[PDB]
């Protein structure tokens, strides 16, 4: 009884690089405000 | 500097949790 709506998901390597960059730059921007 | 002690955990998780999400998505993409 397997569900036919299942799909695989993908994250290519460029998207990983862009995503890791977004998070690290956000962390660098917001960290000073978290420490206050 | 009398900074906020929870600042460390907040920054640490802020980086870690979403970075790990992306890394999981990426590794299982390459292995198919």
């Amino acid at each position: 009884e397997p569900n036919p709506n299942r799909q695989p998901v993908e994250l290519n390597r460029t998207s990983l690089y862009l995503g890791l960059l977004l998070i690290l730059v956000l962390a660098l921007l917001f960290s000073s405000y978290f420490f206050n | 500097m009398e900074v906020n002690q929870l600042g460390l955990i907040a920054t640490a998780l802020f980086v870690l949790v979403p970075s790990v999400f992306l890394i999981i998505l990426y590794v299982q993409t390459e292995s198919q």
């Binding site: 460029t14 690089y17 690290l24 660098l28 | 500097m1 900074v3 920054t11 640490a12 980086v15």
Partner: peptide, 30 residues
């Protein structure tokens, strides 16, 4: 601990630059 944290995140970004450049998905002509 905050100095270490700031420097850490900056260092991670420099490493990402290295991989982003030298281990990019090579662009190819289909």
């Amino acid at each position: 601990m905050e100095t270490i944290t700031y420097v850490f995140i900056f260092a991670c970004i420099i490493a990402l630059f290295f991989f982003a450049i030298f281990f990019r998905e090579p662009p190819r002509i289909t």
